[PDB]
Amino acid sequence: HSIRIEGDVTLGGLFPVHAKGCGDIKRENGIHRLEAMLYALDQINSDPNLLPNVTLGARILDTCSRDTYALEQSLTFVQALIQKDTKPEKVVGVIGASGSSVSIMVANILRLFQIPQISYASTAPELSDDRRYDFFSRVVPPDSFQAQAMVDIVKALGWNYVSTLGSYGEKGVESFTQISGGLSIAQSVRIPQEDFDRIIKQLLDTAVVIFANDEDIKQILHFLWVGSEGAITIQPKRATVEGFDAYFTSRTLENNRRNVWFAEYWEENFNCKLKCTGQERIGKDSNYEQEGKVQFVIDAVYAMAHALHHMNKDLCAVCPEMEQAGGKKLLKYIRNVNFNGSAGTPVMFNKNGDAPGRYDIFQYQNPGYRLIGQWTDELQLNIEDM
Amino acid sequence: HSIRIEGDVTLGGLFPVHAKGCGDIKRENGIHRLEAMLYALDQINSDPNLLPNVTLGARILDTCSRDTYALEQSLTFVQALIQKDTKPEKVVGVIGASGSSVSIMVANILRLFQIPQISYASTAPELSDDRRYDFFSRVVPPDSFQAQAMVDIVKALGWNYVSTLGSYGEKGVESFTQISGGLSIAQSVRIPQEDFDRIIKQLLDTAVVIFANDEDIKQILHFLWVGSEGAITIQPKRATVEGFDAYFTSRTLENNRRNVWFAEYWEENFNCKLKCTGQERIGKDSNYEQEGKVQFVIDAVYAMAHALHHMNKDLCAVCPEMEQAGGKKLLKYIRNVNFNGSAGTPVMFNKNGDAPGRYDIFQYQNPGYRLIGQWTDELQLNIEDM
Ligand SMILES: N[C@](CC1c2ccccc2Oc2ccccc21)(C(=O)O)[C@H]1C[C@@H]1C(=O)O
Ligand SMILES: N[C@](CC1c2ccccc2Oc2ccccc21)(C(=O)O)[C@H]1C[C@@H]1C(=O)O
Ligand SMILES: [Mg+2]
Ligand SMILES: [Mg+2]
């Protein structure tokens, strides 16, 4: 069982509803993220301005946070290509996946069948290879832009000789060393899972560019520290979609029978079975806080809606003319999007199909972090407020 | 419609029954080649020595000589992985394709789903990349081995300064120049489709290594000539499977209703419709000559049968133990085959999964070509009979 919402044109969806063991339900990353695609489709399908006589449908599938399970799920998006000899739908594009390895596997199949993809959460730098991942685009910037911004910070501050402190931790240090111009890296000490103040005491002695996420940063805290007193942090520009909060909060078992995994979500966050009541409120009988990449789910869906809106204006008086265009033509319309997102900020794709890096810069200057500048597209607007 | 032959274990088949426009029926390359897989499966399923209580089934699909049509056909081999919510069979391996571009596209999909492939006709050197084409193996040697043998001929003869005379023509000249050791290439003149004796008159003037196939060689004919008086040719060791000739010759419309494309084959080669008789003999009312790669179809099928035979001996008293092994385990058993083929010659795979090059060497020494040696695995046994 999966979510199948009828429409004139269908958008494939890949969400990690359950974690890898399949397994148990993932509250924020699965349910909020998928419901955001449903909320986005509810918005678009209430909107007379975008896709007027075209209802956007959805085939939303769980990935179980495992790339192999997702690859067998992706086949659902290509059923219409299988010959019948033993209710058709055309999946024009796919919104997902969440978790870069899953997206890579999924890109490997979609590429062959010329079906565009837009990830809302996959951040891996491998995915930036527009030849290998021909049909992949994303609304999140690759983690490489974070490191590029860190080079710019260091260089503008004139650090020169800086020390750098899993799959993510290394990739940051790799991207940072690659940008030369230039500067030299001294001691590149590592910190894995499971020294005690020894690494902190050994601060090169000849700035520290920390690539440790996310509770690892708190463990470390005379010398300057730059991590992704007077420490500098690079952060993404994050936002809440209030419209979606009213939607998810109002979700009960009675009004949300379309989400096949909602009753399963109901048991989890409420610590009850099916003893439970079945008459509680999300923001009342639990601690609700909207998942950070929900903004990127909506943005991913809208990118595709706008791309499909432009195509319909150019090809229809879903007319048959539109029905025989194919993904390579849809990719053009996808890559040419430039519109204001759910957070307010514009949605665009670079040459490789990546979202440009938009980061705020803070320094530990009643103390706390003071906004010391920002990083946009390929520029560093640093201030002398340090 | 496609050929579906029931069995305990199923082998996928890809054959160019029709040419690219789909299109009209291809007599030798489609019908003989597919019927050879049916004949092979008839042999194995009559054999008490190979797969005793295991019937080898087949899902044989037409590729229409177009890689995109074949990619949508390949999905048939992965139907069992598609979830049911809107008669199962497990395709353990695929015999095909014919035409390297088709095999490349097919390898790109099968790789993902860990399903082994064995081509009987795809000769392209790209396919030799055991990392990129992880699950691909072939019973035909890459065209690169022909060029390697040509370097060995030249070098043993001490030519030193030799001149070299589509996708194939260039690939040979590319593979020949790459092997250095070493020798130098003088004038590398080209001959496309649609000079007249001018290129023949200009024979460097400072041996000619001809990479022109197949009617182009006759057009060219003081100096020495080596092409793939006293000219040297490199040829593959070819053979007829007499067992198959009796089979195809005896094929009528009444006894061959399992071949969905046979009645279509009946119209073509006999210049009649459905005025026709429907009571004629293949070798009698037409010119019959067995397609050259039929030997490689049987060999491809047997490779897989032997691989499945060994697996059954190691895992069964098709037991469930065998059913959950998967292609990566079947690939091991595929790559370890060493058995005598339908032509008599042994069937083995190198490190990259390629069949070793086995070529005979002839020289224009009542004149004609005289057997002057051979080339095997990675060795050149040349004779002083020139
Ligand atoms: N953004 C993620 C995360 C990025 C990452 C990249 C590769 C491997 C693991 C990995 O996990 C971490 C851990 C700490 C910091 C950044 C990452 C992605 O996979 O792209 C995506 C799964 C997360 C989601 O947002 O659902
Ligand atoms: N063996 C082929 C042929 C090889 C080739 C390789 C690449 C492109 C075209 C091409 O056509 C020629 C022409 C002349 C000499 C060698 C080739 C393959 O594609 O591998 C395969 C289709 C033929 C079959 O045997 O069904
Ligand atoms: Mg609307
Ligand atoms: Mg038998």
Nearest-10 crossing angle of helices A100-110, A67-74: 30
In 3D space, the residue among A358, A356, A339, A353 whose CA is nearest the CA of residue A118 turns out to be A353
Tokens of residue A111, six digits: 């590429």
- Rounded to whole angstroms, the Cα distance separating A102 from A72 reads 11
Bridge partners (DSSP) of residue A30 are none
Q: Which residue of B has its CA nearest to A74?
A: B82
Distance, CA of A171 to CA of B152 (rounded, Å): 46
List the shell of residues around ion ligand 3, using CB closer than 5 Å.
A 47
Taken in order A167, A173, A175, A178, the sign of the CA dihedral is: negative
Structure-token match 């899972």, residue found: A193
Q: Are strands B358-363 and B232-236 parallel, antiparallel or unpaired?
A: antiparallel
C-alpha–C-alpha distance, residues A64 and B73, integer Å: 28
Distance from CA of B69 to the nearest CA of A (A): 10
| Ligand-binding site membership of A168 (annotated) | yes
A74 touches chain B (CB under 8 A): no
Nearest to A384, CA basis, from A156, A171, A196, A152: A156
Q: Do B75 and A87 touch (CB under 8 A)?
A: no
Q: Which residue has the tokens 């083995």?
A: B348
Residue B76: closest C-alpha in chain A = A82
Beta bridge partners of B376: B358, B379
Are B15 and B51 in contact by the 8 Å Cβ rule? The answer is: no
- Pick from B33, B22, B98, B17: nearest CA to B295: B33
* Alpha-carbon distances, residue B81 vs A72, B78, B322 (angstroms): 6, 6, 18
Q: Distance between CA A318 and CA A305 in Å, rounded?
A: 13
Q: Which residues contact A156 (CB under 8 A, 6 or more apart)?
A: A380, A382
B105/A109 Cβ within 8 A: no
Hey, what are B330's tokens?
A: 């079947």
Residue in B with minimal Cα distance to A1: B85
CA distances from B345 to A172, B98, B243, B298, B302 (A): 55, 22, 16, 13, 13
Atom number, ligand 1, closest to the C-alpha of residue A293: 25
Upper half-sphere CA count for residue A198 (Cβ side, 13 Å):
5
CB-based contact A198:A190 (threshold 8 Å):
no
List strands edge to edge, sheet with A9-15: A3-5, A56-62, A9-15, A91-95, A117-119, A136-138
One-letter amino acid for residue B62 of the chain? D
Q: What are phi and psi of B97, to 5 degrees?
A: -100, -170
Mutate to test the interface with A, among B67, B69, B112, B114 (most CBs of A within 10 A): B112
Q: Is A149 annotated as a binding residue?
A: no
- Residue bearing tokens 């005025």: B275
Q: What HEC string does A231-285 produce?
A: CEEEEECCCCCHHHHHHHHCCCCCCCCCCCCHHHHHHHHCCCCCCCCCCCCCCCC
Cα-to-centroid distance, B100 and ligand 2 (Å): 7
Chain B CB contacts of A87 under 8 Å are 86
- Indicate which technique resolved this structure: X-ray
DSSP line for B231-257: -EEEEE-----HHHHHHHHT--TTT-T
Question: Resolution, rounded to a tenth of an Å?
Answer: 2.8
Give how far A311 is from chain B: nearest CA, Å: 24
DSSP assignment of B184-231: EE-----------SHHHH------EEE---SSHHHHH----EEE----
DSSP state of A157: H
Nearest CA owner, ligand 2 atom 12: B168
Domains by residue range for chain A, with CATH = 1-141+238-356 (3.40.50.2300), 142-237+357-386 (3.40.50.2300)
In angstroms, rounded to a whole number, what is the distance separating the alpha carbons of residues B244 and B34? 12
Residue of B82, B105, B112 lying closest to A76 (CB–CB): B82
